[PDB]
Design a protein around this ligand. Sequence first.
Ligand SMILES: [Co+2]
Ligand SMILES: [Co+2]
Lengths: 21, 21, 21, 21, 21, 21, 30, 30, 30, 30, 30, 30
Amino acid sequence: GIVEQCCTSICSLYQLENYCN
Amino acid sequence: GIVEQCCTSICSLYQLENYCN
Amino acid sequence: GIVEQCCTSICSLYQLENYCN
Amino acid sequence: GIVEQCCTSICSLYQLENYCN
Amino acid sequence: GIVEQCCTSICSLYQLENYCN
Amino acid sequence: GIVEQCCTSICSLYQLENYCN
Amino acid sequence: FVNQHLCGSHLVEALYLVCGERGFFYTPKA
Amino acid sequence: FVNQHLCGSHLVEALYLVCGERGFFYTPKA
Amino acid sequence: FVNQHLCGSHLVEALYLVCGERGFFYTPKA
Amino acid sequence: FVNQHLCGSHLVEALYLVCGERGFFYTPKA
Amino acid sequence: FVNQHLCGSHLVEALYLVCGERGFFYTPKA
Amino acid sequence: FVNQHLCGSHLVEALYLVCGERGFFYTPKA
Ligand SMILES: [Co+2]
Ligand SMILES: [Co+2]
């Protein structure tokens, strides 16, 4: 998922917004 | 919710686990 | 500066990027 | 010790309570 | 103790080293 | 630079003071 | 109790710690 | 904004910054 | 907005996050 | 509570959360 | 001085930084 | 003071502690 991706790879802040409420 | 319980009031770690999935 | 804008007032992340090199 | 264990391995919060005063 | 010295008052890093083992 | 050194190796706090304003 | 106030990012740090692999939700409006 | 390498609690910090007020869900694969 | 206050070390955490590889400057007197 | 993988300052954060008020001793092997 | 207040978990972060491998004790009742 | 192994945001935390008030510049090689 996102947890995994940002840590093994990279992720953007806009990808993180997909986890806001 | 959590903010009222643990930041405006105070809460244990036990209580923090009410917000675990 | 940044302290007045984002800590005494409030600022977006957009605004925080005014302090990027 | 505990420093080493939680980092090389894993450790529980109840193991950490052994370091409170 | 440390809380009075560095959080209620203010303390240097020099002073913080009084709490090193 | 310093970013790189403290992370790949080690760095002292006095080396970090070279980055204060 | 003598329990401390956890606010902001320290409140999400504490949920990460407690919940870890179970995941958690942080919903200030709840 | 720059891409991020975020592990552990560093990713909860970035979520908390990104979602603010809305809050977020932290849901590790497991 | 409903934007939160970022102070101290949380303000530099947030600049690191936003700016990352571009670097940033933190100048409270500015 | 979940098991923890805590290195560096992350372990001091977890101690500070766990012991609160009592305080703690941080004593790395060395 | 213009020294800032270090509280809570930022106070233990700062002791970790200063003391590191020597270890430290954090005792708010002291 | 002890030597430091500081990566990522941990190095911005150490700069913020070291320079305080003066502020600092965070300038990763890139
Ligand atoms: Co804080
Ligand atoms: Co880290």
